[PDB]
CSV table of C-alpha atoms and ligand atoms in Angstrom, one decimal:
chain,number,residue,atom,x,y,z
A,1,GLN,CA,237.5,130.9,183.6
A,2,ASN,CA,238.9,133.3,186.0
A,3,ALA,CA,234.8,132.5,187.9
A,4,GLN,CA,235.5,128.3,187.5
A,5,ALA,CA,239.7,128.2,188.7
A,6,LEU,CA,238.6,130.2,192.3
A,7,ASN,CA,235.0,127.9,192.1
A,8,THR,CA,237.2,124.8,191.9
A,9,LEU,CA,240.2,126.2,194.1
A,10,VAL,CA,237.7,127.3,196.8
A,11,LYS,CA,235.7,123.5,196.4
A,12,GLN,CA,239.2,121.8,197.2
A,13,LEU,CA,238.9,122.3,200.7
A,14,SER,CA,236.3,119.8,201.5
A,15,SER,CA,238.5,117.1,200.2
A,16,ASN,CA,240.7,114.5,202.5
A,17,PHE,CA,242.7,113.3,200.4
A,18,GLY,CA,242.2,109.5,202.2
A,19,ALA,CA,243.0,111.4,206.2
A,20,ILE,CA,240.1,111.4,208.8
A,21,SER,CA,238.6,114.2,207.8
A,22,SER,CA,238.6,117.2,206.3
A,23,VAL,CA,239.2,119.5,210.0
A,24,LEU,CA,242.1,120.1,211.8
A,25,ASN,CA,239.8,120.2,215.3
A,26,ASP,CA,238.6,116.6,214.8
A,27,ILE,CA,241.6,115.7,214.2
A,28,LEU,CA,243.0,117.6,217.3
A,29,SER,CA,240.4,116.3,219.1
A,30,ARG,CA,239.8,112.6,218.2
A,31,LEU,CA,244.1,111.0,217.8
A,32,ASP,CA,246.9,111.6,219.7
A,33,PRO,CA,249.2,113.7,217.7
A,34,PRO,CA,252.1,111.2,216.8
A,35,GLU,CA,248.8,110.1,213.9
A,36,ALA,CA,247.8,113.3,213.5
A,37,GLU,CA,250.5,114.9,212.7
A,38,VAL,CA,250.3,112.3,209.5
A,39,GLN,CA,247.1,113.2,208.8
A,40,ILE,CA,247.4,117.1,208.7
A,41,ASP,CA,251.3,116.1,206.8
A,42,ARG,CA,248.8,114.5,204.1
A,43,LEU,CA,246.1,117.6,204.8
A,44,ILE,CA,248.7,120.2,204.1
A,45,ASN,CA,250.3,117.9,201.1
A,46,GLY,CA,246.9,117.9,199.1
A,47,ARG,CA,246.1,121.5,199.1
A,48,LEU,CA,249.9,122.9,198.8
B,1,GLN,CA,218.4,125.7,211.2
B,2,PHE,CA,221.2,126.5,209.3
B,3,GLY,CA,222.4,128.0,206.1
B,4,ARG,CA,224.8,128.2,202.9
B,5,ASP,CA,226.3,130.2,200.5
B,6,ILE,CA,227.0,129.3,196.8
B,7,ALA,CA,230.0,127.5,197.9
B,8,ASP,CA,228.8,125.8,200.7
B,9,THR,CA,230.0,128.1,203.5
B,10,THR,CA,228.1,129.0,206.5
B,11,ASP,CA,226.0,131.9,206.4
B,12,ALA,CA,223.3,131.8,208.5
B,13,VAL,CA,222.7,130.7,212.1
B,14,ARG,CA,219.0,130.5,214.5
B,15,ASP,CA,220.0,131.9,218.0
B,16,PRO,CA,218.5,128.3,219.9
B,17,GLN,CA,217.1,129.5,222.1
B,18,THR,CA,215.1,132.8,220.8
B,19,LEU,CA,214.9,131.1,217.4
B,20,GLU,CA,216.1,135.0,215.5
B,21,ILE,CA,218.3,134.8,212.4
B,22,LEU,CA,222.0,135.4,212.9
B,23,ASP,CA,223.8,136.5,209.9
B,24,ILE,CA,227.7,135.4,210.1
B,25,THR,CA,230.5,137.4,208.8
B,26,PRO,CA,234.7,136.2,208.5
B,27,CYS,CA,236.8,138.8,210.4
B,28,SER,CA,238.1,141.2,209.0
B,29,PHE,CA,241.4,140.2,207.0
B,30,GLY,CA,243.8,141.9,204.7
B,31,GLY,CA,247.5,143.3,203.5
B,32,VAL,CA,249.2,145.1,205.0
B,33,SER,CA,251.8,147.2,202.5
B,34,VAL,CA,254.2,150.4,203.4
B,35,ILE,CA,254.8,153.4,201.4
B,36,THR,CA,258.7,154.8,201.4
B,37,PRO,CA,260.8,156.5,199.6
B,38,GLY,CA,264.4,155.7,198.9
B,39,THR,CA,266.5,156.3,202.7
B,40,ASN,CA,268.4,158.3,201.4
B,41,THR,CA,266.2,160.8,201.6
B,42,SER,CA,263.9,160.5,204.4
B,43,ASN,CA,263.2,157.8,207.2
B,44,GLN,CA,259.4,158.2,207.3
B,45,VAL,CA,256.8,155.9,206.1
B,46,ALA,CA,253.0,155.4,205.8
B,47,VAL,CA,251.3,152.3,205.7
B,48,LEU,CA,248.1,150.9,204.0
C,1,NAG,C1,272.5,156.2,198.4
C,1,NAG,O1,273.7,156.2,199.8
C,1,NAG,C2,274.7,155.5,200.1
C,1,NAG,C3,275.3,155.0,200.9
C,1,NAG,O2,274.9,154.3,202.2
C,1,NAG,C4,275.1,154.9,198.9
C,1,NAG,O3,275.8,154.1,198.7
C,1,NAG,C5,273.9,154.8,197.2
C,1,NAG,O4,274.7,155.0,196.5
C,1,NAG,C6,273.2,156.0,197.7
C,1,NAG,N1,272.2,156.1,196.2
C,1,NAG,C7,271.9,156.7,195.6
C,1,NAG,C8,270.7,156.6,194.1
C,1,NAG,O5,272.9,158.1,195.5
């Protein structure tokens, strides 16, 4: 049970939760700040 | 040209010029804790 819980927590990082991508660097190097901040906020909410 | 872990994380990569396998280890990190008495006795601390 402990191993499976940790596995799920680790595997949760690959999701995008509706954002453009799951990599912060891609958002930084692809979009402008005013909406890159929105995508980052979406990712932050999901991970929290 | 790439390896992955049981949790699908990058773990190896062939050098693009000289085809040799390079293991990848994440940079060292960890918590910092301090051992200290009641300040009513001394002011020395030890860092672990
Ligand atoms: C430690 O010293 C303070 C003085 O700043 C005092 O208020 C406190 O009661 C002392 N604690 C003990 C356990 O004697």
